[PDB]
Amino acid sequence: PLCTLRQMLGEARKHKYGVGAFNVNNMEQIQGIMKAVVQLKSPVILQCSRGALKYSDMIYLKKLCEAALEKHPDIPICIHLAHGDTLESVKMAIDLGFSSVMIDASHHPFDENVRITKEVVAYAHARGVSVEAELGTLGGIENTVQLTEPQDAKKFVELTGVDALAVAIGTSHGAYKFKSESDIRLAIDRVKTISDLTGIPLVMHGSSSVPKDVKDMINKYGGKMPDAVGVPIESIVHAIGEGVCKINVDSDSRMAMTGAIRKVFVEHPEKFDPRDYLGPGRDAITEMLIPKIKAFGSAGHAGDYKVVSLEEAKAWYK
Amino acid sequence: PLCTLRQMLGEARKHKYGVGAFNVNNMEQIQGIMKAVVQLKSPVILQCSRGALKYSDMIYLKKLCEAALEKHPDIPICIHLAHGDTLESVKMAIDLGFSSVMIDASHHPFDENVRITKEVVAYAHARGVSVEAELGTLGGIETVQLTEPQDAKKFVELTGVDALAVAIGTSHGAYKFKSESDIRLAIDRVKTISDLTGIPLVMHGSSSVPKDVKDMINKYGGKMPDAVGVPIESIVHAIGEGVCKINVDSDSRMAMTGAIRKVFVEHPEKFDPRDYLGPGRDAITEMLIPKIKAFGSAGHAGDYKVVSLEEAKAWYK
Ligand SMILES: O=C(COP(=O)(O)O)[C@@H](O)[C@H](O)[C@H](O)COP(=O)(O)O
Ligand SMILES: O=C(COP(=O)(O)O)[C@@H](O)[C@H](O)[C@H](O)COP(=O)(O)O
Ligand SMILES: [Zn+2]
Ligand SMILES: [Zn+2]
């Protein structure tokens, strides 16, 4: 059933596992993601960006998530606004039925980040909805990136009461996160300190790994992504063990679908039925995701708890 | 709103136009079709084959169609089972909430076709759901059984179906005739079947395989050099003689495929599915606009108040 981010990640903090949060834009993506979490009996977070909602005129995406919730009632499923920037985007998402939202005001100074985030927490928690916020900015270390200062994270959470905190540790969006695989620099040592000082679930953004087979397929069949590099899965597993409970992954699913289509285009150029290539694209998403979900550690946990509904969740904040 | 095939094609027969029936399989395909019919204020039929329902684990396509019905409350939209073979398949589309079903028993001798079809008509009509059947078999003229108009009249009298698919030389796929220079159809009989039966007629296998769409696929790595469709002028003529529903699937498949192949070649560094499926969706829309304009349904979406499935039950009691 629909599940809050607070309960879902609370459970991952407790057992020291992490839950992948996968952005969705259409039917095949959601199916690719659900087949993997179902096969592994794992909880899941489906997140929707403003770009996704625009792409699907909103109602179509809302309906697709309904289908998922209905087809697999036994899977704790969190529907999350991936990256809202105002209170307005939050009311909109909550109206569509989401159980969680992210409010990102990290590019503002501390007190303004606190203020904007506090407004959202009041509105969301009044309806039982979870809130994720961010302190610090994304970008690679190798000047202007602002990594999370643990002592300030402690203060931020105390002042806002967010349910989860996105941390800045050297990751960034996209398929080109580091200049090479031989020199990957992350600031994961502080995760444990942030987790202990805040006492709450942490979130990592820009965390696709850019798996070898997915990249090789794209470049083998006419794609041009020779220098792609993502976050090593070992690093993510280390951060998970230190308190990271939610890992945002999008690029990996993007590449897996693109590589799959590119291969069908080359091996069978006479085929023109979209199911002929979107099918293998959906499945390549499932196959790429299975070893990832196991490493995150959420496999087997879908049946660990009884899902609290949004209505009952209101009591946590009163 | 959700509309029955009986009413939608009834309005088309009366005003001498045809309504496109487009097969859907996922979100982008439904969006591209909807944008075209919404832009042209045209009624529309979205049809789902058994393959589509398997491709989409059924529930996802049901929900997407609901999204279309809710987003555009003013467009009469018929949700039809594209090609059921058994009463079992019809029952499953009805349980998903479809407003129309096709039961094709055309490969069976006349009597058995009639028997199988009647059983589906009894079940469907008790819910107000429309039924399309077929007399004659698909396939080109150059074993194919073209529709015998006098038999078509008896078949319709005996079954009570709301629409009849006719066999006049069309066939499914992108290689309908050996060359564009030798295209032979049996359109002469459409008018006769129309008058003899008194009901809306349906054309299957009627994608036109438009040149631009064909050129794009072959320009960017595709391999469909000999593809050929039904000329649009031939469909326009059949519509004026009684054809009210025209099934089109290959054209949208090709329009989406050519668009993705072009982005792949022009921006080989792009890997976000929205970057190519977006253009794939718009290609479908642009390819469909001139097609819907020629079918004649533009501007008719507001001609009638839509009778719901519940009220429709009265038509058959
Ligand atoms: O961190 C994320 C994924 O990063 P990634 O490149 O997969 O390592 C997500 O939360 C992003 O915010 C998301 O992928 C952005 O999607 P759009 O805004 O382009 O739709
Ligand atoms: O007549 C039709 C379209 O023909 P076409 O090749 O587009 O001229 C449809 O009714 C077909 O039945 C439909 O395209 C079949 O779809 P699937 O069974 O492959 O899903
Ligand atoms: Zn994000
Ligand atoms: Zn058909």
XYZ file of C-alpha atoms and ligand atoms in Angstrom:
677
model
C 0.000 0.000 0.000
C 0.929 3.689 -0.120
C 3.562 4.331 2.532
C 5.095 7.415 4.123
C 8.785 8.212 3.696
C 9.063 8.532 7.495
C 7.981 4.945 8.220
C 9.744 3.405 5.171
C 13.123 4.998 5.918
C 12.703 4.579 9.683
C 12.624 0.872 8.985
C 15.712 1.055 6.787
C 17.595 3.088 9.490
C 16.692 0.427 12.130
C 17.984 -2.555 10.017
C 20.760 -0.660 8.369
C 19.626 -1.096 4.766
C 18.930 1.475 2.047
C 15.920 1.982 -0.261
C 16.356 3.009 -3.872
C 14.185 5.986 -4.998
C 13.597 5.798 -8.726
C 12.302 8.645 -10.852
C 9.409 7.635 -13.164
C 8.251 9.317 -16.399
C 6.136 6.728 -18.199
C 4.572 3.266 -18.250
C 7.568 1.043 -19.139
C 9.796 2.784 -16.533
C 7.338 2.127 -13.706
C 6.897 -1.494 -14.869
C 10.654 -1.985 -15.156
C 11.074 -0.693 -11.584
C 8.110 -2.632 -10.059
C 9.159 -5.995 -11.531
C 12.517 -5.693 -9.821
C 11.186 -4.646 -6.406
C 8.444 -7.307 -6.525
C 10.863 -10.118 -7.434
C 13.033 -9.062 -4.470
C 10.073 -8.441 -2.150
C 11.472 -4.944 -1.510
C 9.880 -1.631 -0.477
C 10.272 1.105 -3.085
C 10.088 4.880 -3.610
C 8.834 6.140 -6.948
C 9.707 9.800 -7.309
C 8.301 12.328 -9.724
C 10.160 15.480 -10.820
C 8.531 18.638 -12.161
C 9.878 17.537 -15.516
C 8.131 14.188 -15.267
C 4.837 15.761 -14.305
C 5.151 18.138 -17.270
C 5.979 15.243 -19.654
C 2.904 13.278 -18.572
C 0.474 16.214 -18.265
C 0.355 15.078 -14.643
C -2.849 13.003 -14.759
C -1.130 10.202 -16.747
C 1.683 9.827 -14.201
C -0.778 9.920 -11.300
C -2.740 7.175 -12.992
C 0.317 5.038 -13.690
C 1.309 5.151 -9.986
C -2.242 4.172 -9.097
C -1.904 1.146 -11.288
C 1.290 0.148 -9.492
C -0.289 0.595 -6.052
C -3.227 -1.495 -7.129
C -1.341 -4.285 -8.906
C 0.985 -4.896 -5.895
C -0.957 -4.106 -2.660
C 1.610 -6.023 -0.590
C 4.541 -3.761 -1.480
C 5.134 -0.678 0.710
C 5.189 2.003 -2.000
C 6.150 5.608 -1.339
C 5.081 8.141 -3.958
C 7.479 11.110 -3.573
C 7.658 14.627 -5.169
C 11.307 14.349 -6.205
C 12.482 17.911 -5.995
C 9.927 20.617 -5.195
C 11.261 24.181 -4.883
C 8.190 25.971 -3.356
C 5.285 25.384 -0.949
C 3.026 25.541 -4.028
C 4.685 22.539 -5.713
C 4.127 20.729 -2.406
C 0.369 21.483 -2.172
C 0.100 20.382 -5.793
C 1.835 17.014 -5.110
C -0.129 16.431 -1.917
C -3.336 17.101 -3.853
C -2.320 14.464 -6.413
C -2.126 12.041 -3.491
C 1.675 11.781 -2.891
C 2.755 10.529 0.534
C 5.999 12.449 0.599
C 7.661 15.547 -0.814
C 11.119 17.033 -1.034
C 11.539 20.819 -0.563
C 14.975 21.968 -1.734
C 16.058 25.423 -0.600
C 19.737 24.490 -0.217
C 20.815 27.229 -2.627
C 19.552 29.795 -0.109
C 21.369 30.873 3.046
C 20.748 28.776 6.166
C 17.971 30.873 7.810
C 16.065 31.163 4.513
C 16.506 27.400 3.844
C 15.128 26.849 7.386
C 12.218 29.293 6.823
C 11.151 27.941 3.391
C 11.540 24.328 4.653
C 9.610 25.046 7.893
C 6.585 26.318 5.972
C 6.431 23.076 4.007
C 6.854 20.923 7.129
C 3.824 22.613 8.755
C 1.646 21.984 5.698
C 2.870 18.449 4.998
C 2.833 17.104 8.553
C -0.680 18.476 9.038
C -1.761 15.954 6.414
C 0.537 13.087 7.469
C 2.886 13.627 4.482
C 6.638 13.124 4.821
C 9.195 15.864 4.116
C 12.744 15.565 2.837
C 14.922 18.707 2.665
C 18.539 19.441 1.798
C 21.478 21.193 3.460
C 24.495 21.673 1.217
C 24.840 21.548 -2.608
C 25.470 18.914 -5.235
C 28.607 18.904 -7.366
C 31.995 17.240 -7.587
C 34.794 18.263 -5.183
C 37.514 18.357 -7.879
C 35.660 26.467 -4.230
C 31.858 26.665 -4.900
C 30.282 23.337 -3.962
C 29.001 23.450 -0.415
C 29.423 20.110 1.353
C 27.255 19.417 4.401
C 28.807 20.579 7.730
C 27.615 18.002 10.339
C 27.187 20.498 13.176
C 24.990 22.659 10.955
C 22.948 19.608 9.851
C 22.220 18.976 13.566
C 20.845 22.495 13.850
C 18.916 22.410 10.621
C 16.957 19.275 11.600
C 16.233 20.588 15.135
C 14.903 23.851 13.626
C 12.797 22.221 10.919
C 11.721 18.777 12.051
C 12.137 17.279 8.600
C 11.718 13.502 8.312
C 14.835 13.035 6.128
C 17.846 15.100 5.073
C 19.584 15.119 1.705
C 23.372 15.453 2.218
C 26.054 17.021 -0.006
C 29.054 14.758 -0.254
C 30.601 15.077 -3.688
C 27.941 13.412 -5.851
C 26.279 15.216 -8.765
C 23.526 14.509 -11.377
C 24.208 12.847 -14.684
C 26.396 10.268 -16.345
C 29.716 12.141 -15.975
C 30.297 12.433 -12.221
C 34.083 12.235 -12.103
C 36.752 12.956 -14.754
C 37.785 9.275 -14.725
C 37.157 6.016 -12.834
C 40.735 6.075 -11.594
C 40.048 9.201 -9.572
C 36.696 9.164 -7.785
C 36.615 11.495 -4.743
C 33.726 11.395 -2.293
C 33.281 12.817 1.208
C 31.505 9.861 2.800
C 33.368 9.944 6.122
C 30.953 12.551 7.492
C 27.795 10.496 6.846
C 28.034 8.642 10.200
C 28.581 11.933 12.039
C 25.585 13.500 10.315
C 23.422 10.504 11.083
C 24.403 10.402 14.759
C 24.007 14.189 15.250
C 20.664 14.457 13.473
C 19.223 11.118 14.567
C 17.327 10.793 11.247
C 17.384 9.025 7.818
C 19.808 10.546 5.266
C 19.386 10.800 1.491
C 22.013 10.649 -1.273
C 21.291 12.332 -4.620
C 23.183 11.905 -7.919
C 23.847 8.310 -7.061
C 23.569 6.302 -10.264
C 26.543 3.939 -10.674
C 26.768 3.834 -14.497
C 27.185 0.011 -14.616
C 29.655 -1.327 -17.170
C 27.319 -3.460 -19.288
C 24.791 -0.629 -19.732
C 27.471 1.827 -20.899
C 29.170 -0.691 -23.182
C 25.837 -1.423 -24.948
C 25.143 2.202 -25.635
C 28.611 2.836 -27.124
C 28.601 -0.450 -29.016
C 25.375 0.402 -30.823
C 25.927 3.960 -32.022
C 25.676 5.924 -28.809
C 28.282 8.482 -27.874
C 28.962 8.242 -24.091
C 32.586 7.183 -24.017
C 33.558 8.969 -20.731
C 30.552 8.057 -18.501
C 31.274 7.389 -14.836
C 29.007 7.128 -11.795
C 29.249 6.374 -8.056
C 30.789 2.916 -7.263
C 28.300 0.597 -5.609
C 30.802 -0.135 -2.745
C 30.784 3.539 -1.797
C 27.017 3.561 -1.680
C 26.947 0.379 0.439
C 29.488 2.056 2.820
C 27.321 5.178 3.093
C 24.259 2.995 3.708
C 25.987 1.307 6.598
C 26.634 4.746 8.049
C 23.082 6.011 7.964
C 22.139 6.747 4.349
C 18.605 5.227 3.875
C 17.375 6.644 0.493
C 19.421 6.603 -2.735
C 18.240 8.572 -5.784
C 18.932 6.803 -9.071
C 17.696 7.912 -12.449
C 20.469 8.018 -15.047
C 21.108 4.223 -14.687
C 17.439 3.524 -15.754
C 17.759 6.091 -18.546
C 20.871 4.410 -19.927
C 19.551 0.859 -19.512
C 16.478 1.690 -21.645
C 18.537 3.552 -24.306
C 21.161 0.807 -24.662
C 18.382 -1.800 -25.101
C 16.605 0.178 -27.793
C 19.901 0.916 -29.608
C 20.716 -2.782 -29.684
C 17.324 -3.786 -31.202
C 17.650 -0.967 -33.772
C 20.987 -2.447 -34.967
C 20.281 -6.198 -34.843
C 16.774 -5.952 -36.336
C 16.502 -2.769 -38.368
C 13.290 -3.949 -40.031
C 11.344 -3.817 -36.754
C 9.146 -0.795 -36.117
C 6.685 -1.747 -33.425
C 7.526 0.275 -30.314
C 6.792 -2.816 -28.172
C 9.642 -4.473 -30.105
C 12.202 -2.180 -28.413
C 10.448 -0.534 -25.406
C 9.819 -4.101 -24.163
C 13.570 -5.015 -24.005
C 14.114 -1.456 -22.637
C 11.721 -2.084 -19.760
C 13.358 -5.447 -19.042
C 16.888 -4.088 -19.189
C 15.771 -1.661 -16.494
C 14.597 -4.598 -14.374
C 17.853 -6.572 -14.905
C 20.175 -3.618 -14.169
C 18.190 -2.809 -10.985
C 18.128 -6.296 -9.413
C 21.807 -6.457 -8.435
C 21.542 -2.804 -7.266
C 18.571 -3.390 -4.976
C 20.279 -6.374 -3.339
C 23.392 -4.255 -2.639
C 21.207 -1.435 -1.179
C 19.862 -4.179 1.091
C 16.132 -3.654 0.893
C 15.519 -7.104 -0.673
C 13.292 -9.200 1.609
C 11.956 -6.321 3.670
C 8.661 -5.480 2.017
C 6.787 -7.656 4.526
C 8.573 -6.403 7.683
C 5.918 -3.917 8.775
C 2.311 -2.874 8.687
C 1.920 0.297 6.693
C 0.607 3.317 8.494
C -1.761 5.381 6.332
C -1.514 9.138 5.807
C -4.518 9.661 8.090
C -2.935 7.752 10.970
C 0.415 9.452 10.306
C -0.997 12.828 11.376
C -0.737 11.570 14.954
C 3.057 11.431 14.761
C 3.133 15.201 14.516
C 0.437 16.108 17.101
C -16.864 11.005 -22.059
C -16.881 7.199 -22.481
C -18.906 6.600 -25.579
C -20.448 3.527 -27.202
C -19.374 2.564 -30.704
C -23.062 2.374 -31.743
C -23.599 6.071 -31.011
C -20.242 7.298 -32.294
C -20.450 5.479 -35.625
C -24.156 6.210 -35.824
C -23.336 9.917 -35.861
C -20.601 9.336 -38.385
C -22.804 7.280 -40.729
C -25.487 9.964 -40.664
C -23.036 12.816 -41.542
C -20.919 10.776 -43.958
C -17.636 10.847 -42.065
C -15.347 8.220 -40.584
C -13.700 8.047 -37.184
C -10.131 6.809 -36.789
C -9.674 3.876 -34.414
C -6.100 3.933 -33.197
C -4.462 1.072 -31.284
C -2.732 2.105 -28.099
C -0.003 0.402 -26.123
C 1.474 2.901 -23.640
C 1.410 6.505 -22.386
C 3.147 8.370 -25.263
C 1.001 6.662 -27.901
C -2.277 7.641 -26.166
C -1.020 11.228 -25.675
C -0.035 11.683 -29.317
C -3.427 10.415 -30.471
C -5.303 12.549 -27.941
C -3.473 15.746 -28.823
C -4.436 15.223 -32.471
C -8.125 14.593 -31.873
C -8.350 17.324 -29.243
C -6.692 19.828 -31.569
C -9.244 18.853 -34.307
C -12.324 18.623 -32.009
C -12.849 15.078 -33.253
C -14.433 12.009 -31.673
C -11.950 9.095 -31.328
C -11.708 5.366 -30.745
C -8.759 4.054 -28.752
C -8.427 0.318 -29.310
C -6.496 -2.228 -27.379
C -5.531 -5.581 -28.671
C -4.918 -8.648 -26.551
C -1.152 -7.979 -27.111
C -1.478 -4.433 -25.736
C -3.321 -5.722 -22.686
C -0.501 -8.233 -22.064
C 2.206 -5.649 -22.799
C 0.621 -3.359 -20.180
C -0.345 -6.008 -17.582
C -3.910 -4.738 -18.282
C -4.286 -2.379 -15.310
C -1.728 0.210 -16.667
C -3.583 0.623 -19.944
C -6.936 0.828 -18.115
C -5.596 3.600 -15.920
C -4.033 5.443 -18.854
C -7.316 5.411 -20.746
C -8.978 6.839 -17.562
C -6.353 9.600 -17.590
C -7.400 10.424 -21.195
C -11.143 10.310 -20.352
C -10.651 12.601 -17.325
C -8.226 15.050 -19.057
C -10.623 15.633 -21.937
C -14.199 15.267 -20.603
C -15.706 16.847 -23.733
C -14.374 14.434 -26.344
C -16.536 11.391 -27.069
C -14.005 8.556 -26.634
C -14.772 4.951 -27.275
C -12.538 2.332 -25.667
C -12.699 -0.782 -27.854
C -11.273 -4.334 -27.715
C -9.501 -4.381 -31.040
C -9.843 -8.023 -31.978
C -11.370 -10.580 -29.615
C -11.462 -14.221 -30.741
C -13.596 -15.661 -27.947
C -16.393 -14.727 -25.581
C -13.695 -15.100 -22.947
C -11.717 -12.103 -24.310
C -14.798 -9.978 -24.656
C -15.683 -10.695 -20.989
C -12.312 -9.503 -19.864
C -12.511 -6.181 -21.796
C -15.979 -5.619 -20.338
C -14.603 -6.193 -16.812
C -11.958 -3.540 -17.537
C -14.767 -1.189 -18.436
C -14.482 -1.032 -22.250
C -17.442 0.460 -24.095
C -17.078 -1.703 -27.245
C -15.727 -5.062 -28.383
C -14.749 -6.705 -31.662
C -15.543 -10.422 -32.010
C -13.903 -11.894 -35.093
C -15.100 -15.353 -36.063
C -14.650 -14.698 -39.781
C -12.413 -17.741 -40.331
C -15.355 -19.964 -39.372
C -18.113 -21.083 -41.806
C -21.001 -18.548 -42.012
C -23.205 -20.476 -39.539
C -20.531 -20.885 -36.884
C -19.480 -17.211 -37.292
C -23.091 -16.276 -36.625
C -23.315 -18.583 -33.580
C -20.108 -17.310 -31.968
C -20.978 -13.713 -32.759
C -24.561 -13.926 -31.341
C -23.333 -15.277 -27.998
C -21.001 -12.264 -27.685
C -23.789 -9.915 -28.801
C -26.123 -11.266 -26.077
C -23.528 -10.807 -23.345
C -22.221 -7.378 -24.508
C -25.639 -5.807 -25.171
C -26.908 -6.755 -21.722
C -24.279 -4.191 -20.477
C -24.895 -1.627 -23.248
C -21.519 -2.496 -24.791
C -21.242 -2.384 -28.587
C -20.168 -5.236 -30.835
C -18.207 -5.200 -34.093
C -17.975 -8.509 -36.047
C -16.411 -9.543 -39.341
C -17.683 -11.302 -42.495
C -14.984 -11.960 -45.073
C -11.233 -12.367 -44.482
C -8.342 -9.875 -44.599
C -5.644 -10.114 -47.157
C -4.792 -8.754 -50.577
C -6.183 -9.789 -53.952
C -2.900 -10.113 -55.954
C -8.037 -18.137 -50.412
C -8.816 -14.538 -49.331
C -12.639 -14.344 -49.010
C -13.997 -10.867 -49.940
C -17.281 -9.865 -48.322
C -20.405 -11.069 -50.177
C -22.878 -8.155 -49.646
C -26.037 -10.274 -49.774
C -24.513 -12.591 -47.148
C -23.489 -9.497 -45.105
C -27.140 -8.498 -44.997
C -28.201 -11.901 -43.662
C -25.308 -11.950 -41.151
C -26.293 -8.603 -39.688
C -29.979 -9.573 -39.469
C -29.068 -12.773 -37.669
C -26.548 -11.300 -35.192
C -27.733 -7.791 -34.280
C -24.171 -6.449 -34.228
C -23.637 -2.645 -34.164
C -20.925 -2.548 -36.868
C -19.423 -4.841 -39.438
C -15.836 -5.121 -40.563
C -15.654 -5.774 -44.287
C -13.040 -7.618 -46.411
C -12.156 -5.657 -49.490
C -8.473 -6.351 -50.174
C -6.682 -4.603 -47.286
C -4.368 -6.381 -44.976
C -2.350 -5.653 -41.824
C 1.252 -4.385 -41.884
C 3.544 -2.108 -43.836
C 3.841 -4.231 -47.038
C 0.224 -4.271 -48.213
C 0.752 -4.350 -52.037
C 3.820 -5.416 -54.059
C 4.353 -1.951 -55.553
C 2.595 1.424 -55.328
C 1.918 1.160 -59.074
C -0.343 -1.864 -58.724
C -2.815 -1.386 -55.883
C -6.126 -3.188 -56.385
C -9.030 -2.931 -53.893
C -12.739 -4.015 -53.958
C -14.281 -0.695 -52.943
C -17.126 -0.932 -55.392
C -19.070 -3.113 -52.975
C -18.889 -0.881 -49.882
C -21.971 1.132 -50.851
C -23.859 -2.081 -51.587
C -22.935 -3.618 -48.168
C -23.851 -0.321 -46.522
C -27.370 -0.170 -48.043
C -28.038 -3.881 -47.661
C -27.067 -3.894 -43.960
C -28.103 -0.403 -42.940
C -25.268 -0.264 -40.379
C -21.860 1.386 -39.973
C -18.990 -0.446 -41.739
C -15.417 -0.869 -40.535
C -12.145 -0.984 -42.443
C -9.174 -2.945 -41.041
C -5.553 -2.820 -42.167
C -5.914 0.739 -43.389
C -2.625 2.539 -42.526
C -1.458 4.623 -45.497
C 2.299 4.219 -44.987
C 2.882 7.968 -45.684
C 6.153 8.761 -47.549
C 7.724 11.147 -45.047
C 7.311 8.631 -42.235
C 8.727 5.857 -44.489
C 11.673 8.049 -45.575
C 12.621 8.915 -42.017
C 12.825 5.253 -40.972
C 14.954 4.339 -44.002
C 17.111 7.468 -43.698
C 18.185 6.711 -40.170
C 19.118 3.033 -40.274
C 15.735 1.382 -40.578
C 15.140 -1.259 -43.246
C 11.676 -0.867 -44.778
C 12.475 -0.032 -48.436
C 9.399 -1.704 -49.973
C 6.737 -0.577 -47.509
C 3.343 0.363 -49.024
C -0.026 1.345 -47.562
C -3.587 2.076 -48.616
C -3.785 5.401 -50.489
C -5.768 7.911 -48.403
C -7.969 8.846 -51.391
C -9.232 5.258 -51.488
C -10.211 5.424 -47.773
C -11.869 8.807 -48.282
C -13.954 7.284 -51.033
C -14.964 4.218 -48.971
C -16.016 6.556 -46.111
C -18.406 8.398 -48.448
C -19.933 4.981 -49.288
C -20.595 3.849 -45.728
C -17.314 3.037 -43.959
C -17.481 4.709 -40.540
C -14.477 3.273 -38.658
C -10.920 2.980 -39.926
C -8.339 0.985 -37.992
C -4.814 2.467 -38.071
C -1.810 1.096 -36.132
C 1.240 0.634 -38.454
C 1.353 4.384 -39.305
C 1.692 5.359 -35.640
C 4.246 2.557 -35.073
C 6.343 3.912 -37.943
C 5.938 7.546 -36.989
C 7.256 6.887 -33.462
C 10.040 4.598 -34.687
C 11.324 7.037 -37.334
C 11.498 9.878 -34.801
C 13.516 7.907 -32.249
C 15.928 6.709 -35.030
C 16.463 10.331 -36.185
C 17.378 11.562 -32.620
C 19.681 8.533 -32.171
C 21.634 9.528 -35.337
C 21.569 13.330 -34.797
C 22.318 13.461 -31.060
C 24.034 10.191 -30.310
C 25.079 11.433 -26.865
C 21.471 11.722 -25.620
C 20.154 8.915 -23.406
C 17.111 10.277 -21.593
C 14.013 8.411 -22.931
C 12.024 11.695 -22.798
C 14.461 13.059 -25.461
C 13.335 10.586 -28.107
C 9.940 9.299 -26.995
C 8.870 12.985 -26.728
C 9.589 13.533 -30.445
C 8.118 10.035 -31.123
C 4.838 11.191 -29.480
C 4.739 14.444 -31.448
C 5.523 12.622 -34.709
C 2.392 10.542 -34.142
C 0.372 13.673 -33.566
C 1.574 15.441 -36.735
C 1.129 12.359 -38.923
C -2.471 11.922 -37.618
C -3.748 15.467 -38.128
C -3.966 15.433 -41.921
C -5.305 11.843 -41.670
C -8.148 12.775 -39.261
C -8.949 15.829 -41.404
C -9.375 13.640 -44.466
C -11.494 11.022 -42.546
C -13.952 13.899 -41.913
C -14.404 13.748 -38.129
C -12.836 17.109 -37.267
C -15.344 19.526 -35.614
C -17.841 16.809 -34.710
C -16.853 16.110 -31.121
C -19.617 18.520 -29.949
C -22.496 17.224 -32.114
C -24.166 14.972 -29.564
C -24.779 14.332 -25.880
C -23.063 11.032 -25.009
C -25.310 8.179 -23.858
C -23.687 6.201 -21.039
C -23.365 2.389 -20.940
C -26.126 2.251 -18.346
C -28.616 4.190 -20.508
C -27.440 2.248 -23.549
C -28.935 -0.915 -22.079
C -32.324 0.440 -23.114
C -31.402 0.186 -26.772
C -31.409 -3.582 -26.485
C -34.425 -4.262 -24.270
O 19.592 12.500 -7.854
C 18.898 12.090 -8.778
C 19.455 11.064 -9.771
O 20.796 11.385 -10.138
P 21.607 10.441 -11.168
O 22.007 11.148 -12.406
O 20.657 9.182 -11.481
O 22.874 9.902 -10.338
C 17.452 12.559 -8.961
O 16.866 12.910 -7.706
C 17.424 13.741 -9.928
O 16.925 14.895 -9.246
C 16.511 13.419 -11.116
O 17.105 12.360 -11.870
C 16.286 14.618 -12.039
O 15.273 14.297 -13.000
P 14.589 15.463 -13.868
O 14.369 16.700 -13.086
O 15.575 15.713 -15.114
O 13.218 14.863 -14.458
O -6.290 -3.150 -38.680
C -5.471 -2.780 -37.835
C -4.280 -1.901 -38.237
O -3.744 -2.298 -39.502
P -2.477 -1.547 -40.156
O -1.318 -2.463 -40.292
O -2.105 -0.287 -39.226
O -2.985 -0.973 -41.568
C -5.658 -3.176 -36.375
O -7.042 -3.483 -36.171
C -4.814 -4.404 -36.011
O -5.679 -5.439 -35.535
C -3.786 -4.066 -34.931
O -2.772 -3.256 -35.530
C -3.131 -5.323 -34.348
O -2.330 -5.014 -33.202
P -1.618 -6.191 -32.368
O -2.414 -7.438 -32.315
O -0.173 -6.386 -33.051
O -1.305 -5.631 -30.894
Zn 16.227 14.857 -7.135
Zn -7.869 -5.485 -35.487
